[PDB]
Amino acid sequence: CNKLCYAVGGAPYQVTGCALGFFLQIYLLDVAQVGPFSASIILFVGRAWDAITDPLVGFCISKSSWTRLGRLMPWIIFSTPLAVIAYFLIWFVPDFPHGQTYWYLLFYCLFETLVTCFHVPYSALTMFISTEQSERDSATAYRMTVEVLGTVLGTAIQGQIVGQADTPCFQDLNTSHRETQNAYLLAAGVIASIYVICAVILTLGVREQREPYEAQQSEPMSFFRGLRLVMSHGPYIKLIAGFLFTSLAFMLVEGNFALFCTYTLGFRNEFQNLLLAIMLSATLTIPIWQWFLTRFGKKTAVYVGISSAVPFLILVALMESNLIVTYVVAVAAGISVAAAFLLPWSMLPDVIDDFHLKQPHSHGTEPIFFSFYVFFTKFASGVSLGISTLSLDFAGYQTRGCSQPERVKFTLKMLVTMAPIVLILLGLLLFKLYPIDEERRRQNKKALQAL
Amino acid sequence: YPASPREWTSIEAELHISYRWDPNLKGLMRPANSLLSTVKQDFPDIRQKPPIFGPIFTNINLMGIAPICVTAKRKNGTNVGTLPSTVCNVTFTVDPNQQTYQTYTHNQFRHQPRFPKPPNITFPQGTLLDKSTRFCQGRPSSCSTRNFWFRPADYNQCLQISNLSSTAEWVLLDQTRNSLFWENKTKGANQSQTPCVQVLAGMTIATSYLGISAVSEFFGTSLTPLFHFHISTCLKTQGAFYICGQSIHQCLPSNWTGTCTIGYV
Ligand SMILES: *[C@@H]1O[C@H](CO)[C@@H](O[C@@H]2O[C@H](CO)[C@@H](O[C@@H]3O[C@H](CO[C@H]4O[C@H](CO[C@H]5O[C@H](CO)[C@@H](O)[C@H](O)[C@@H]5O)[C@@H](O)[C@H](O)[C@@H]4O)[C@@H](O)[C@H](O[C@H]4O[C@H](CO)[C@@H](O)[C@H](O)[C@@H]4O[C@H]4O[C@H](CO)[C@@H](O)[C@H](O)[C@@H]4O)[C@@H]3O)[C@H](O)[C@H]2NC(C)=O)[C@H](O)[C@H]1NC(C)=O
Ligand SMILES: *[C@@H]1O[C@H](CO)[C@@H](O[C@@H]2O[C@H](CO[C@@H]3O[C@H](CO[C@H]4O[C@H](CO)[C@@H](O)[C@H](O)[C@@H]4O)[C@@H](O)[C@H](O[C@H]4O[C@H](CO)[C@@H](O)[C@H](O)[C@@H]4O)[C@@H]3O)[C@@H](O)[C@H](O)[C@H]2NC(C)=O)[C@H](O)[C@H]1NC(C)=O
Ligand SMILES: *[C@@H]1O[C@H](CO)[C@@H](O)[C@H](O)[C@H]1NC(C)=O
Ligand SMILES: *[C@@H]1O[C@H](CO)[C@@H](O)[C@H](O)[C@H]1NC(C)=O
Ligand SMILES: *[C@@H]1O[C@H](CO)[C@@H](O)[C@H](O)[C@H]1NC(C)=O
Ligand SMILES: *[C@@H]1O[C@H](CO)[C@@H](O)[C@H](O)[C@H]1NC(C)=O
Ligand SMILES: *[C@@H]1O[C@H](CO)[C@@H](O)[C@H](O)[C@H]1NC(C)=O
């Protein structure tokens, strides 16, 4: 019955990630008062710190031993209370004569490392949770659907509680502070309670199974040998290379659409749950993709998943606006990003099996794969934000105002549609990874022959 | 010809406010927007149609010595025609330096915004000293435009202008509201009320005001100017053209340099 119990673990990370990524800048500029300078600095440093901490926490997990508890479950146990206090505390605005601004940076970086410390073992646990591929893939698909539903939940709850989550605008020319602060605090409290209840229900039942007797129990080296052998392995890098382009394109989309919806080809000044609609459609879709990969999902699932975005998204080439069909396009993109989330993230256990049987004696190297994978996801986030900001700066958007020049529309139209079209095209072309259905069954044979 | 000191009271002026954002501002979007809205609806009675500036009639003027002329000089301000000291009987000089930034209390701001008070009139020595202890003229008509910048309701003082109408019908000035009232001197009596906005008040208040707020930031706290709104005055009655030099303006710019009397024809 543990399948749901493990699946719920994605929500505590995902809801906070979404809430922060969508609201922290607005809160920093408005509810607290920080200059645009320091706001940009805090955001950039927080993301950079997250990327930097990801491999290091991965290493400390790899080094950590099994002492009177789960191999990596004490990491969740150490993370949950401190991370929840940090997430609550960051939202509160400190009243101080001096040094007020640092508080935000410190508690943002600290909460971020703590939540990565939660996430990475939770991602790695899919290998351990059960040995057979069928239940393994079941559990990972369940985790992914609950994670995307966590995205939906976090965005919806924060928006509804704190009021309309819209890009602020400066009307063209030709409700108390403590009350809105208390609103943000209520949001922090309910999201923290969701985090705590999710972590406890997750920890209550997974009861990871310890490793069987290993062929080489002595002489493992965590600092170097793991990295060296992972670099020696080639399908893993081929997989992450193929996944990087797809993930970058779709995160670029999800990021810049927030301003596309108003400034360019937007008949509504408010997104009004459009993002919630597309993400909920993705959450509904993901089980269909799991079953689809049951029915010849070797590589067809990723082909159809990435390719389905192309025609519906490019329907902006016709560009003649009609809001209801545009909503339909958003739903289409929902099922496309559902495939983009579920497939490559859960293909990885097959790669780790192929590496595991290829070289026997190397043991305990599993968390390195997951750590570097989530690190490359964060790196894609960084480069997506960088290209978006650089393009917008270089063309248009000299000032934030309700009226925007025509240039912004050209750059941000081509950016939102054509750049992800070409990016997913190249990624999908380069995505001809080594293991297919034949390869998985062949690895399966050796797996069952080992012990 | 120039209007009578009584006509200065009777004539009505309307004021037009134009708002301009600060380009460098990129923060405090929601609170600055709410503040702009509350300021915008703070002024209930304004000129709806966009005002017209510039010399309008520019005839070779025929005029007598003027009873009141207003002179303002600024570093960088629009210039309007000048009349020498001989022409005007008495003079009020606008001096902006006396104005200082006062804190405009807003509901949602960790650092309260500051605005500049309107300028003040000054007069040469010995012209308004006759107190004569006559406050009772203080009451104006009802006016709903009380606010931070503009308060025609408060009646602190009324003092006589000695150099005008000593024998009878003495003219009183309330400096606090920079407004003036005319009396007729007869035991039996009838007397008019003031318009909501005096022409003299409209002339004096006409300067752009910059709202500033301070935001906590790295390397110390920083000053960000939210926005600034220009104010221009326009007569709302026939004639009443601002004679200034030879020129005859219908309305006055945001910062105006020169000497102006309100006249006819
Ligand atoms: C019609 O005429 C009128 C006048 O005849 C014109 O009105 C003038 O408009 C000017 C527009 O620029 C304006 O000049 C600015 O005035 C600002 C007012 O500053 C006030 O406050 C500061 C201090 O505030 C702090 O006060 C205490 C501590 O002192 C604190 O407790 C508070 O919390 C505050 O934090 C004083 O210095 C002033 O005396 C006022 O009291 C100024 O902010 C501003 O100066 C800044 O900008 C200058 C260049 O832009 C620069 O030289 C100066 O050093 C300041 O620089 C600050 O800002 C930059 C970014 O802006 C920042 O990077 C720096 O770190 C630095 O902090 C100007 O001086 C006139 O005041 C105003 N005159 C009036 C109203 O009488 C009107 O324009 C004109 N219109 C037309 C159409 O002609
Ligand atoms: C230069 O130009 C300045 C700006 O034009 C001008 O400043 C004006 O001065 C008056 C000051 O007079 C006092 O103002 C008090 C304000 O009180 C109001 O607000 C508070 C809270 O906001 C309330 O408690 C009050 O009820 C009121 O709403 C006011 O309380 C005082 O009234 C008392 O005194 C008088 C007698 O003088 C009595 O009749 C009253 O009943 C009461 O007892 C007093 O009026 C300021 O009010 C006015 O708003 C200022 N103008 C503007 C536009 O803001 C300078 O005077 C001027 N100086 C020179 C030398 O020219
Ligand atoms: C007056 O304003 C104009 C417009 O900005 C400016 O070019 C000029 O130099 C100003 N005069 C000064 C600063 O003395
Ligand atoms: C009145 O004004 C005239 C000049 O305008 C001057 O001769 C006279 O002394 C003034 N008297 C007073 C009391 O101001
Ligand atoms: C000023 O007005 C008075 C009002 O009686 C009158 O003597 C004349 O119009 C003016 N006086 C001078 C000296 O200009
Ligand atoms: C003042 O009013 C009375 C009658 O109300 C009249 O006799 C007198 O001429 C008037 N004077 C002026 C200057 O209006
Ligand atoms: C002023 O009002 C009173 C009140 O009716 C009236 O009797 C008087 O004649 C009026 N006088 C003038 C000059 O209007």
Side-chain angles (χ1 to χ4, degrees), chain B residues 74 76 96 99 101 114 116 207-208 210 212 214 223 225 230 255:
Chain B
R74 311 191 183 256
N76 221 358
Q99 84 202 4
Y101 281 75
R114 299 179 299 120
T207 292
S208 88
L210 173 62
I212 276 177
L223 258 60
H230 301 83
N255 278 5

Side-chain angles (χ1 to χ4, degrees), chain A residues 26 29-38 41-42 93-96 100-102 105 168-173 175-177 180 397-400, chain B residues 19-34 36-37 40 50 106-111 214-220 222 224:
Chain A
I26 274 304
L29 295 175
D30 298 351
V31 167
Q33 267 87 356
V34 169
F37 179 89
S38 309
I41 296 307
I42 289 163
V93 27
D95 53 316
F96 289 154
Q100 186 173 355
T101 170
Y102 308 84
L105 173 146
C169 206
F170 282 151
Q171 57 190 280
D172 200 341
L173 302 169
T175 63
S176 74
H177 170 87
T180 179
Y397 210 95
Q398 280 320 295
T399 172
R400 307 187 61 260
Chain B
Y19 307 87
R20 179 179 180 171
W21 283 105
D22 195 357
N24 270 284
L25 168 82
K26 291 179 192 302
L28 290 79
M29 292 77 63
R30 166 70 175 282
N33 198 316
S34 170
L36 163 77
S37 158
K40 177 167 295 178
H106 194 274
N107 201 350
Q108 37 187 9
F109 264 101
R110 294 186 72 257
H111 272 150
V215 57
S216 72
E217 182 208 89
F218 278 159
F219 296 85
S222 59
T224 62

Side-chain angles (χ1 to χ4, degrees), chain B residues 212-250:
Chain B
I212 276 177
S213 181
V215 57
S216 72
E217 182 208 89
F218 278 159
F219 296 85
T221 178
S222 59
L223 258 60
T224 62
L226 308 176
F227 65 95
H228 62 79
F229 63 103
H230 301 83
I231 296 196
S232 61
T233 180
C234 281
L235 278 310
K236 196 182 131 159
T237 312
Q238 329 291 334
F241 291 97
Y242 296 101
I243 308 280
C244 320
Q246 189 190 355
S247 316
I248 300 112
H249 304 82
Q250 155 70 37

